[PDB]
Write a protein that binds this ligand. Structure first.
Ligand SMILES: O=c1[nH]cnc2c1ncn2[C@H]1CC[C@@H](CO)O1
Ligand SMILES: O=c1[nH]cnc2c1ncn2[C@H]1CC[C@@H](CO)O1
Ligand SMILES: O=c1[nH]cnc2c1ncn2[C@H]1CC[C@@H](CO)O1
Lengths: 288, 288, 288
């Protein structure tokens, strides 16, 4: 985990402990425009990234740069509003530092969210996709958050990712959606991480499509991965904010204004979802 | 753009201004063996990379390591003879530093050239290919020149690349070729950037082929990308210097001696082309 | 070769010379659990990585962290028990430093081994695969050991990899296997390097499969590549330690305990193989 040491994590976890009365169980990292979830907490105790000991700040635009503590629909969460991306300069051991601290803080579940582009045509903007799998492109080329000496206090050298996106939690998600009897089904498919801040070209989109991806994005994977390394339960969704183009002869392209998505009903649609889903995450009590 | 600051760009742009009387409009970055284009300028004022304030030098072999100023077939260009490649150690924010300076210098068009390998069988060495699209392999894994804090004085955080290789300029190129009624057509296809200085293996070539690439090379993309980020018009060609191999049972491989291509008629064929094409790049006057 | 200089290599080669009487011809780099080969040497003179001048140490767990010198089945080898991987923090110019020193030491052949995952279904664990080709994933994204200024004292700027895994030595391997009339054939196929220490997901495995890979692993390529750059003869095998998963609905995943493979007969099976194969590597005498 180059950069930080165990004790850096300990010292930050502890600092958090002795500065909040909350002992979170589920850590939620909100993607673009889905940070409204913070609103729904209770007994909320906000923490500015910067105020915490070794916490990677979030540049100057880190307006939504805070770690909120509270209770949501039954569980004592800890939310990350506004995360770190590879594309902004953060080496991956800064991007994923939270996940290690959430672990030592006591977390045992991580529900990671993000807005992503739509590659699967069956997807339509506004859609919500269940990450059943991911393709760690940067990781293939060495951009893996576990590069460097491994700490057997955190996990194994070679953790398997075959499993990562918890199966049961996916049943429960498919099901909770149906319970809400929602208009439009809870999409499910493979999520592909691509770093670059620029948006995919039509030649790029096509390789991802053949590659098996369904939604493309620029984060999540580093947090998914290091969480699993820790032994955290993991599941997540993607807010399809825009359909990804294809050559032939187009007329559109892709813009961030499409973030209107991340804020429109869609946003707060996933928020209700994520809220109700708190009721389907097992307690540490090993419930019986 | 880690490494340099806005003012580093300003200070270099200005230095260039107050050291040349030329206010270039089109910046041309010449690939291997196609640097003969410099010959054709007029009112040529050569500048040694090294003499310019923050300009990345080009090692010791930077013989063809200069930025020539002048007029070509009607426009006041600024040419880069001998560029920087990832494979020689340059972090991408040094490779692409010129494109930012050409921008502040006033440029509004960039015609980037390179020699590339032939993947599409329809290609035959000597051929010239029109880059209609590109696959930014390094970029997928984080090797994107826009990594780091974004400067809204240069462009947007998430620029789309869906478009990059200007459409009209491609009509004009296909057309100008036909105007010259040239022997052999102006190929067009997708260009794939691969970093490594070594040459592709037969297992590698095959993945690129299925991946959609037509020509493979080791540059251009970083300059294409940062140009678009700036709002520069962009179009380019590749000089197929050698056909890329495929398993089965071969007898050849790939060598740099194949640069004979980059210097043979082919070279100066693209040079006449690029020269005449100056007549088809719109003026800043918004011509009417 | 950023990091070290020619003289760093010279100073280490020489140090090795004036500290051993052995002038090795074949350098063997043993993969996981196949380091038992060291046992079979004779006139063995062990050297602790750390004791050698610029030699990258191997962390604290570098127990099997030594460079053994001796004679094996006829040739004066030099073996690397326990290599360096990208995933442990080593920049590739440290990972591959040995290959440069083995070169200056006089080596002219490198037989590299590794344990790898099975992607080709025809593969069955325990199997041994002949690396006929490789797909340098990290290399595509810039992770190539030849990045930086090139030393024409070592090799060419753009070395071709079209060839790398010596053809004749493969005939001899297929043949020697048949000579032993072994139970189970000497598999042959394409080896794909993936960096990350974590194990491939089912979405990842599928892209590698379509990509053409047969076995997947996390090393070898950097050593294969820099060897060829030097002009070393190269050939290698992979010990399929585990079959790689695929979605649908599985029940297994991948664990390091599967290293039981690397140590079981399989291990010492490749060891006899590699030993007998010493008899099929040409001598520097240009035998006649
Ligand atoms: O089509 C897409 N490709 C890649 N990343 C995407 C796409 N759509 C959304 N994002 C992610 C990456 C950054 C942020 C911008 O809103 O959202
Ligand atoms: O087949 C090829 N693959 C990759 N790069 C290539 C190929 N052909 C040319 N170049 C580019 C990369 C470096 C320079 C050497 O002349 O030209
Ligand atoms: O399925 C696999 N995928 C990637 N690397 C693998 C696989 N199997 C073995 N290794 C390599 C990488 C590290 C070491 C762990 O024993 O062996």
């Amino acid at each position: 985990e180059n950069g930080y040491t165990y004790e850096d994590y300990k010292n930050t976890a502890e600092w958090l402990l002795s500065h909040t009365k909350h002992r979170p169980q589920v850590a939620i990292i909100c993607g673009s425009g889905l940070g409204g979830l913070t609103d729904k907490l209770t007994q909320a105790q906000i923490f500015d990234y910067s105020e915490i000991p070794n916490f990677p700040r979030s540049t100057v635009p880190g307006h939504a740069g805070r770690l909120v503590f509270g209770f949501l629909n039954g569980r004592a969460c800890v939310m990350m509003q506004g995360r770190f991306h590879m594309y902004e300069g953060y080496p991956l051991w800064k991007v994923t530092f939270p996940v290690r601290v959430f672990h030592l803080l006591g977390v045992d579940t991580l529900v990671v969210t993000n807005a992503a582009g739509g590659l699967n045509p069956k997807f339509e903007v506004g859609d919500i996709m269940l990450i059943r799998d991911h393709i760690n492109l940067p990781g293939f080329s060495g951009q893996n958050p576990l590069r460097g000496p491994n700490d057997e206090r955190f996990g194994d050298r070679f953790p398997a990712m075959s499993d990562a996106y918890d199966r049961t939690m996916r049943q429960r998600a498919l099901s909770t959606w149906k319970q809400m009897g929602e208009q439009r089904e809870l999409q499910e498919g493979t999520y592909v991480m691509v770093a670059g801040p620029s948006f995919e070209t039509v030649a790029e989109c096509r390789v991802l499509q053949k590659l098996g991806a369904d939604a493309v994005g620029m984060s999540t994977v580093p947090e998914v991965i290091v969480a699993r390394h820790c032994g955290l339960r993991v599941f997540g969704f993607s807010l399809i904010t825009n359909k990804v183009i294809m050559d032939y002869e187009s007329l559109e392209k892709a813009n961030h204004e499409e973030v209107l998505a991340a804020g429109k009903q869609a946003a707060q649609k996933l928020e209700q979802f994520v809220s109700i889903l708190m009721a389907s995450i097992p307690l540490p009590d090993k419930a019986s």
